[PDB]
């Protein structure tokens, strides 16, 4: 399948309360495997999945050096961005970066990413050619001319076609039993009387990995997406995910309704109903 290695960098300036705080996390697919926090005493890259504890100390030493670099560079970034937007010193601002690589089934690089946001809005992004940038605005255009003049994209190109694909494959191997084993949803329907006119049929998908899922209701073969309550997929807290879809049905009608579950962990799509 299409596995991904993604790093998420967040820096927040706190005027008056010292220098900016840097936070980084890394994920393989929907699984967090590292963190870093520049406010930690003697801050280090810390494993957060079982299967990354099985690198040498030097692996964490390396990630630590890079996260300290990213922390420092962002301290300047927040300063130069305040200048670009001609903002005062008093407001807190945010810089975000998301970078990584997608691996398609061939096992070679499908797609590289490296994108930035200032106060949550698009700022600059490496285009999929890995050579040109898309700037969101006149401030980011300054950054685009400077990074194009310096040939910065080659360094992300290097990292991407080299290290990123390499370490993704290492992680997918070391984590085979977790990352490359899909857990199917356990599906059930509950029944929650509301009134003389309405009974809520709730279809539950529990204990599934990865996060991606389709949960639908049909009335006699007829999709109910426009008139069903659907919650955002949510973490169980044990590394699995949850979702539900619900419809208001007239009492007695319950057996007209079928709930459909599709997930890469199911040989067959599940069809189920009340009782």
């Amino acid at each position: 399948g299409p596995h991904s290695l993604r790093y998420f960098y967040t820096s927040v300036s706190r005027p008056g309360r010292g220098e900016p705080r840097f936070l980084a996390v890394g994920y393989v697919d929907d699984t967090q495997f590292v963190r870093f926090d520049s406010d930690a005493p003697n801050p280090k890259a810390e494993p957060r999945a079982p299967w990354v504890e099985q690198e040498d100390p030097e692996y964490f030493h390396r990630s630590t050096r890079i996260f300290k670099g990213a922390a420092q560079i962002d301290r300047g970034n927040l300063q130069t961005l305040r200048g670009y937007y001609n903002q005062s010193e008093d407001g807190s601002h945010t810089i975000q970066r998301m970078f990584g690589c997608d691996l398609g089934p061939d096992g070679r690089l499908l797609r590289g990413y490296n994108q930035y946001a200032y106060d949550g809005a698009d700022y600059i992004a490496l285009n999929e050619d890995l050579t040109s940038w898309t700037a969101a605005d006149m401030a980011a255009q300054i950054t685009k001319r400077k990074w194009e003049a310096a040939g910065d994209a080659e360094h992300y190109r290097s990292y991407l076609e080299g290290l990123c694909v390499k370490w993704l494959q290492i992680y997918l191997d070391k984590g085979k039993e977790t990352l490359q084993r899909a857990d199917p949803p356990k599906a059930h329907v509950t029944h929650h009387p509301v009134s003389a006119r309405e009974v809520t049929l709730r279809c539950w998908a529990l204990g599934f990995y990865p996060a991606d899922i389709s949960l639908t209701w049909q009335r006699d073969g007829e999709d109910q997406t426009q008139d069903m309550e659907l919650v955002e997929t949510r973490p169980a807290g044990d590394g699995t995910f949850q979702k539900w879809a619900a419809v208001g049905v007239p009492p007695g009608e319950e057996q007209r309704y079928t709930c459909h579950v599709q997930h890469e962990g199911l040989p067959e799509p599940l069809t189920l109903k009340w009782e």
Binding site: Y7, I73, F99, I124, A140, D152, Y156, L163, W167
Partner: peptide
């Protein structure tokens, strides 16, 4: 393994 931008914005 992560990566840090050569230069600031």
């Amino acid at each position: 393994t992560p990566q840090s931008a050569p230069h600031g914005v």
